[PDB]
Amino acid sequence: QVQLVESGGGVVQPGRSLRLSCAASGFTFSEWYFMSWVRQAPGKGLEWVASIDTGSGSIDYAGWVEGRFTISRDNSKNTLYLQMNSLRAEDTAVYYCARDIGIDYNFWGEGTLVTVSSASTKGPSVFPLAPTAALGCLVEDYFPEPVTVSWNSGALTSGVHTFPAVLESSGLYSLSSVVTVPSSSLGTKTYICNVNHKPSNTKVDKRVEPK
Amino acid sequence: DIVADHVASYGVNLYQSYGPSGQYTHEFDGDEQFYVDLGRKETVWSLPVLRQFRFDPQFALTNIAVLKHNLNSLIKRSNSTAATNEVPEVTVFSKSPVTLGQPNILICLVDNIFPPVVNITWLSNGHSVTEGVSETSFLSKSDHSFFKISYLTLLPSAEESYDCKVEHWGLDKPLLKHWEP
Amino acid sequence: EPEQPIPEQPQPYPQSPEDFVYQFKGMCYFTNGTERVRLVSRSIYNREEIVRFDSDVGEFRAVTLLGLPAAEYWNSQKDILERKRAAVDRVCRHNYQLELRTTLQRRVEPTVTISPSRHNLLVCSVTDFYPAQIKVRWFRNDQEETAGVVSTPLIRNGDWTFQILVMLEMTPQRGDVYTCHVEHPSLQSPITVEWRA
Amino acid sequence: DIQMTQSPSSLSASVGDRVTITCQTTQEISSYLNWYQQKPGQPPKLLIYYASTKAEGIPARFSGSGSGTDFTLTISSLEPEDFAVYYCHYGISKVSFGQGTKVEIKRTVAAPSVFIFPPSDEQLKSGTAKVVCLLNNFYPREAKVQWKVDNALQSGNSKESVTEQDSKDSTYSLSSTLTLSKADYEKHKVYACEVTHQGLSSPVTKSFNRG
């Protein structure tokens, strides 16, 4: 299979530096390719950062970059790099890695969030929500933004709404995840919510049941 | 076998696994109009009256990226049938009649080039001549072979003889083609 | 607003060092200016044309067995066909307008020179001319000579100029004047070069 | 660099409608214009290449037209799974993207399934009560959620979160979270959630008493 995997994201203080990597697999950089870094600030559009010809090493940057960012590759390792310096709040975005943009049978990575903040990496506190019926999960006080809620290990999909996180006055994120459940169940079925805040290594599993 | 007053190739797109290498050019009546430098990403016009036009190098880059995909697919469907090296046919001549003292251009046509990977060098008394040396891109042929012409700016002299040296995979050793006034 | 040669687009395929070669040629054939215009887009694997788009056919045709999956898939999509059908006007007819003001207006006047060969041959070198269209004639005292006249084929120099050598085998008697008569589209009136026995 | 602008920035259309999005470039690019589609939380997906050629596997309702500086993406008959932001694109090495056009689905009026979640016993055990209120699968987005604590109207102590429009049924879901101290929570008994919507004849209240 062919895929691009971004890594190196998380939190970073303004003025500091960060180096993202995008590992390729299922093809080799030596076959001549255009590898690109495209970023997307939350709720904003796609913004191209830089491209690199794996063959000739040709580089193009967006006019706004102006030396702050450096794109590079290693054909031996099959990895694309983005070295960012003097980070600002403006650079908080999901950084995507892509192959030959605009051509059929080509790929884009899933992305990696890069949060430019003075704040500390804090973990969440998952609390259950006691209930044609509905149950829930409060995932309170965490930093940075990316958390995954899947419920009982990706088995239930229908009527599962995980709400976007809201930033509290303290500076931490908080969200709820609900699911429509049949009236007949509660004591027969054991619904558990799975929460994984990857930047703090927090895989809290809290099953919800009426008291 | 088509008959026409004029014939153009609004795309001689070429891609090879060796390198890998590519070549993008436009031809009109057998002459090279321009080529896209795929490394520098710029269009280089061959006739100066054509410099009034633009040709987006990213048109050529997208086409060569598609050819790369098709090449890979064809390597799969053909069960890796590779190109067979052809024997190039070299001919050295002059742009104008030779008059000693009067500047001239020694022309080296290397015809029947396949695959399109070749070295064309000039020699004078067994030593390589590097200044005044220029060349065309690989120009297409109807039988899907190529030709390439190399040039050497000269000031003819009775005691100065030159050679056109060609290195191709279809030759046992470098083919040296002599020219003298 | 700068004018630009429009290129033909290769279609992505569905789904001693060793070398694998691929060529895509967007051929445009023109007869009587733009009266008759034909587009032939050739896909070549190594030295074999595998699939073609001939505008006179209006469809992808597999030339070889290798071009089969591509001619079936590309033909099954009206988007691709709708596009290649237009390419005769978008690519061929469009770019000919650009040629009318530049390549089809290029004129380089020939340089006519006569020199004896080093058994009795006068060589008339007609060098550095453009377009190809040339007519060379040999005369011995205003009388045309054809029987003893041989030419080389047209020599393409590669730098947008042609060259031709027109040779005459003769028997010189004192007072004989041989004339190379060259006609070319870039000339006002024929060039006449004399050689005296 | 080449710049691209789309029209409109967003649109709302019903299932079965013909949607038309335009892209205009600052320079002639022949027919080398591509269209991407991005759904929420996913990387962009190539829809069209060469201005009008559909990518392998793309539904027949998706089409493109145009050359030079003016291009158009058409969805001949809109489906609920077509809720996404669409982007025009040019460039394999120097990459330009349009600003994006958000496509929203006009659907029939639906009413919210209201639910009220009393605070977690484990969360109260920490010092604060977060009473949650869920509004499920409603259309349109416009909804009023009023908190009542012992019939007294609340204001300035709740936050709201809305999900993105559903891909299958085109509905929204909402979570209003009332935040109170444990001391103020314990000083009252009746907790209501009055919900106002176009799909409701009269406001639906969901309430709970402590125990």
Chain B closest-CA separation from residue C84 CA (Å): 14
With residue B2 as reference, give the H or E element that holds it: none
Q: For A122, which DSSP code? A: B
List the subunits that have 3+ CB pairs under 8 angstroms with D: A, B, C
Which of helix, strand or coil describes residue D129?
strand
Long-range contacts of D21-24 (CB under 8 A, 24+ apart): D21/D72, D21/D73, D21/D74, D21/D86, D21/D101, D21/D103, D22/D70, D22/D71, D22/D72, D22/D73, D23/D66, D23/D70, D23/D71, D23/D72, D23/D73, D23/D88, D23/D98, D24/D69, D24/D70, D24/D71
List the subunits that have 3+ CB pairs under 8 angstroms with A: B, C, D
With residue B26 as reference, give the H or E element that holds it: strand B21-28
DSSP state letters, chain C: ----PPPPPPPPPP------EEEEEEEEEEETTTTEEEEEEEEEETTEEEEEEETTTTEEEESSGGGHHHHHHHHT-HHHHHHHHHHIIIIIIHHHHHHHTTGGG--B--EEEEEE----EEEEEEEEEBSS--EEEEEETTEEE-TTEEEPPPEE-SSS-EEEEEEEE----TT-EEEEEEE-TT-SS-EEEEEE-
| For helices C78-87 and C68-75, angle between their N-to-C axes, nearest 10 degrees | 100
How many CA atoms, within 13 angstroms, populate the side-chain half-sphere of residue B80? 1
Q: For D55, which DSSP code? A: P
| Alpha-carbon gap, residue A165 to A137, rounded angstroms | 13
B41 and A58: CB-CB below 8 Å? yes
Q: For D163, which DSSP code? A: P
**Residues with Cβ < 8 Å from D172, sequence gap 6 or more?**
D137, D138, D139, D140, D141, D162, D163, D164, D165, D166
Overall residue count recorded for chain D in this entry:
211
Cα angle D149, A141, D136 (rounded to 5 degrees) comes to: 55
Q: How many Cβ atoms from other residues are within 10 Å of residue B86's Cβ?
A: 18
* Residue pairs between chains A and C whose CB atoms are closer than 8 Å: 3
End-to-end CA distance of chain D: 66
Q: Which residue on chain D is closest to A42 by alpha carbon?
A: D41
Domains of chain C: 22-104 (3.10.320.10), 106-196 (2.60.40.10)
Selection from D35, D43, C71, A34 nearest residue B69 by Cα: A34
Q: Enumerate the residues of chain D whose CB falls inside 8 A of the CB of residue B59.
A: 30, 32
Selection from A85, A95, A139, A141 nearest residue A115 by Cα: A95
User: Rounded to the nearest 5°, which phi and psi values hold at D80?
Assistant: -60, -25
Method: X-ray
Indicate the pairing of strand A133-142 with strand A148-149.
unpaired
- C20 and chain A in contact, CB less than 8 A: no
| Alpha-carbon gap, residue D63 to D53, rounded angstroms | 8
Strand order in the sheet with A69-74: A3-7, A18-25, A79-84, A69-74
Selection from D93, D80, D89 nearest residue D36 by Cα: D89
Interface with A, mutate which of B16, B41, B71 (most A CBs under 10 A): B41
| Alpha-carbon gap, residue D137 to A134, rounded angstroms | 13
Assess whether A88 and A136 both reside in one domain.
Answer: no
Indicate the pairing of strand D101-106 with strand D10-14.
parallel
- C-alpha distances in Å from residue C32, one per residue of B7, C35, C57, C132: 12, 5, 21, 17
| Alpha-carbon gap, residue B91 to C155, rounded angstroms | 11
- C-alpha distances in Å from residue B41, one per residue of A52, A58, A59, C11, D93: 12, 8, 10, 22, 9
| Alpha-carbon gap, residue A37 to A9, rounded angstroms | 14
Residue B124 in contact with residue B133, Cβ under 8 Å? no
Assess whether A89 and A20 both reside in one domain.
Answer: yes
Q: How many Cβ atoms from other residues are within 10 Å of residue D195's Cβ?
A: 24
- Chain CA centroid to CA D110, Å: 16
Cα angle C19, C24, C28 (rounded to 5 degrees) comes to: 145
- D31 and chain A in contact, CB less than 8 A: no
| Alpha-carbon gap, residue A40 to A26, rounded angstroms | 26
| Alpha-carbon gap, residue B120 to B122, rounded angstroms | 7
| Alpha-carbon gap, residue C181 to C139, rounded angstroms | 8
Assess whether A9 and A112 both reside in one domain.
Answer: yes
Long-range contacts of B128-135 (CB under 8 A, 24+ apart): B129/B162
- Chain CA centroid to CA C107, Å: 15
Last residue of a domain, one of D82, D106, D130: D106
Q: How many domains does chain D have?
A: 2
Assess whether A106 and A133 both reside in one domain.
Answer: no
User: Rounded to the nearest 5°, which phi and psi values hold at B68?
Assistant: -60, -35
| Alpha-carbon gap, residue B55 to B64, rounded angstroms | 15
Cα angle A89, A95, A96 (rounded to 5 degrees) comes to: 160
Selection from D80, D139, D78, D144 nearest residue D110 by Cα: D139
| Alpha-carbon gap, residue D114 to D123, rounded angstroms | 22
Selection from C47, C171, C70 nearest residue C116 by Cα: C171
Assess whether D128 and D151 both reside in one domain.
Answer: yes
Last residue of a domain, one of D75, D106, D137: D106
Assess whether A81 and A185 both reside in one domain.
Answer: no
User: Exposed e or buried b for every residue in C71-81, given b needs 16+ CB within 10 A?
Assistant: bebbeebebbb
Residue B2 in contact with residue C29, Cβ under 8 Å? yes
Domains of chain B: 8-77 (3.10.320.10), 89-179 (2.60.40.10)
Indicate the pairing of strand D70-75 with strand A69-74.
unpaired
Q: For A198, which DSSP code? A: G
| Alpha-carbon gap, residue B12 to D133, rounded angstroms | 66
Tell me, what amino acid is at A17?
A: S
Last residue of a domain, one of D87, D106, D125: D106
Selection from C65, B168, A179 nearest residue D175 by Cα: A179
Assess whether A106 and A154 both reside in one domain.
Answer: no
Assess whether D86 and D126 both reside in one domain.
Answer: no
**Residues with Cβ < 8 Å from C192, sequence gap 6 or more?**
C179, C180, C181, C182
User: Exposed e or buried b for every residue in A171-200, given b needs 16+ CB within 10 A?
Assistant: ebbbbbbbbbbeeeebeeeebbbbbbbebb
| Alpha-carbon gap, residue B169 to B118, rounded angstroms | 8
Beta strands in chain D (DSSP E): 4-7, 10-14, 19-25, 34-38, 45-49, 53-54, 62-67, 70-75, 84-90, 96-97, 101-106, 113-117, 128-138, 144-149, 152-153, 158-162, 172-181, 190-196, 204-209
Q: Which residue on chain D is closest to B61 by alpha carbon?
A: D92
Q: For B19, which DSSP code? A: T
Residue A73 in contact with residue A100, Cβ under 8 Å? no
| Alpha-carbon gap, residue C92 to C54, rounded angstroms | 13
| Alpha-carbon gap, residue D91 to B159, rounded angstroms | 55
Q: Which residue on chain C is closest to D29 by alpha carbon?
A: C6
Assess whether D120 and D37 both reside in one domain.
Answer: no
Which of helix, strand or coil describes residue D21?
strand
Selection from D109, D106, D49 nearest residue D82 by Cα: D106
Selection from C110, C107, C108, C126 nearest residue C167 by Cα: C126
Indicate the pairing of strand A112-116 with strand A10-12.
parallel
A136 and D134: CB-CB below 8 Å? yes
Assess whether D134 and D188 both reside in one domain.
Answer: yes
- CATH number of the structural domain spanning residue A137: 2.60.40.10
Selection from B70, B27, D61, B157 nearest residue C14 by Cα: B70
Question: A107: which 2 tokens?
Answer: 């790929």
- B30 and chain C in contact, CB less than 8 A: yes
List the subunits that have 3+ CB pairs under 8 angstroms with B: A, C, D
| Alpha-carbon gap, residue B3 to B12, rounded angstroms | 20
| Residue A43 CB burial class (10 angstroms; 0-12, 13-18, ≥19) | exposed
| Alpha-carbon gap, residue B179 to A113, rounded angstroms | 66
Q: For A163, which DSSP code? A: P
* Residue pairs between chains C and D whose CB atoms are closer than 8 Å: 23
C77 and D30: CB-CB below 8 Å? no
Assess whether D78 and D22 both reside in one domain.
Answer: yes
How many CA atoms, within 13 angstroms, populate the side-chain half-sphere of residue D32? 26
Assess whether D69 and D40 both reside in one domain.
Answer: yes
| Alpha-carbon gap, residue B165 to B88, rounded angstroms | 12
Beta strands in B114-145 (DSSP E): 119-124, 127-129, 133-135, 139-140
Indicate the pairing of strand B6-16 with strand D53-54.
unpaired
Residue A138 in contact with residue A174, Cβ under 8 Å? yes
Indicate the pairing of strand B42-45 with strand D204-209.
unpaired
With residue B16 as reference, give the H or E element that holds it: strand B6-16
Assess whether A27 and A106 both reside in one domain.
Answer: yes
**Residues with Cβ < 8 Å from C43, sequence gap 6 or more?**
B70, C10, C22, C23, C24, C49, C50, C51, C52, C67, C70
End-to-end CA distance of chain B: 40
User: Rounded to the nearest 5°, which phi and psi values hold at B180?
Assistant: -150, 150
Residue D39 in contact with residue D167, Cβ under 8 Å? yes
- CATH number of the structural domain spanning residue D197: 2.60.40.10
- Chain CA centroid to CA D70, Å: 29
| Alpha-carbon gap, residue B120 to B89, rounded angstroms | 12
| Residue C88 CB burial class (10 angstroms; 0-12, 13-18, ≥19) | middle
| Alpha-carbon gap, residue B113 to B144, rounded angstroms | 9
Question: C8: which 2 tokens?
Answer: 């033909």
| Residue A1 CB burial class (10 angstroms; 0-12, 13-18, ≥19) | exposed
With residue D123 as reference, give the H or E element that holds it: helix D121-124
Assess whether A107 and A26 both reside in one domain.
Answer: yes
**Residues with Cβ < 8 Å from D183, sequence gap 6 or more?**
none
Chain B closest-CA separation from residue A158 CA (Å): 40
Q: Enumerate the residues of chain B whose CB falls inside 8 A of the CB of residue A105.
A: 69
- C-alpha distances in Å from residue A9, one per residue of A24, A95, A172: 17, 8, 18
Assess whether D70 and D118 both reside in one domain.
Answer: no
Question: D91: which 2 tokens?
Answer: 């460039």
| Alpha-carbon gap, residue A41 to A93, rounded angstroms | 4
**Residues with Cβ < 8 Å from C12, sequence gap 6 or more?**
A103, A104, A105, B66, B69, B70
Cα angle D94, D95, D98 (rounded to 5 degrees) comes to: 140
Assess whether A129 and A91 both reside in one domain.
Answer: no
With residue D183 as reference, give the H or E element that holds it: helix D182-186
User: Rounded to the nearest 5°, which phi and psi values hold at D150?
Assistant: 60, 45
Domain that holds residue A45: 3-116
Q: How many Cβ atoms from other residues are within 10 Å of residue B84's Cβ?
A: 12
Tell me, what amino acid is at A36?
A: S
| Alpha-carbon gap, residue D144 to D152, rounded angstroms | 17
Last residue of a domain, one of A67, A86, A116: A116
User: Rounded to the nearest 5°, which phi and psi values hold at A185?
Assistant: -85, 175
| Alpha-carbon gap, residue A194 to A97, rounded angstroms | 28
Residue C180 in contact with residue C138, Cβ under 8 Å? yes
Selection from C53, C66, C51, C47 nearest residue C26 by Cα: C53
- Torsion, Cα A25 A30 A31 A37, to 10 degrees, reads 60
Selection from D52, D51, D55 nearest residue D32 by Cα: D51
D161 and A53: CB-CB below 8 Å? no
- C12 and chain A in contact, CB less than 8 A: yes
Assess whether A80 and A158 both reside in one domain.
Answer: no
Domain that holds residue D186: 113-209
User: Exposed e or buried b for every residue in C130-147, given b needs 16+ CB within 10 A?
Assistant: bbeebebbbbbeeeebee
Residue C158 in contact with residue B139, Cβ under 8 Å? yes
Assess whether A52 and A93 both reside in one domain.
Answer: yes
- C-alpha distances in Å from residue B101, one per residue of B86, B154, B157, D83, D149: 39, 9, 6, 77, 108
Residue A57 in contact with residue A39, Cβ under 8 Å? no
| Alpha-carbon gap, residue D171 to B141, rounded angstroms | 62
Selection from C164, C121, C122 nearest residue B93 by Cα: C164
Assess whether A12 and A111 both reside in one domain.
Answer: yes
User: Rounded to the nearest 5°, which phi and psi values hold at C24?
Assistant: -125, 120
Sort residue A86 into left (φ over 0), alpha (ψ -120 to 50) or beta: left
With residue B98 as reference, give the H or E element that holds it: none
Chain B 38-67, residues with CB within 8 Å of chain C CB atoms:
46-47, 49-50, 52-56, 59-60, 62-63, 66-67
- A28 and chain B in contact, CB less than 8 A: no
**Residues with Cβ < 8 Å from B14, sequence gap 6 or more?**
B21, B22, B23, B24, B67, B116, B138, C21, C22, C23
Residue A29 in contact with residue A73, Cβ under 8 Å? yes
Rg of chain A (C-alpha set): 21
| Alpha-carbon gap, residue C131 to C128, rounded angstroms | 10
**Residues with Cβ < 8 Å from D138, sequence gap 6 or more?**
D110, D111, D112, D171, D172, D173, D174, D197, D199
Q: How many domains does chain A have?
A: 2
Longest dimension (CA), chain B: 58
- B12 and chain C in contact, CB less than 8 A: yes
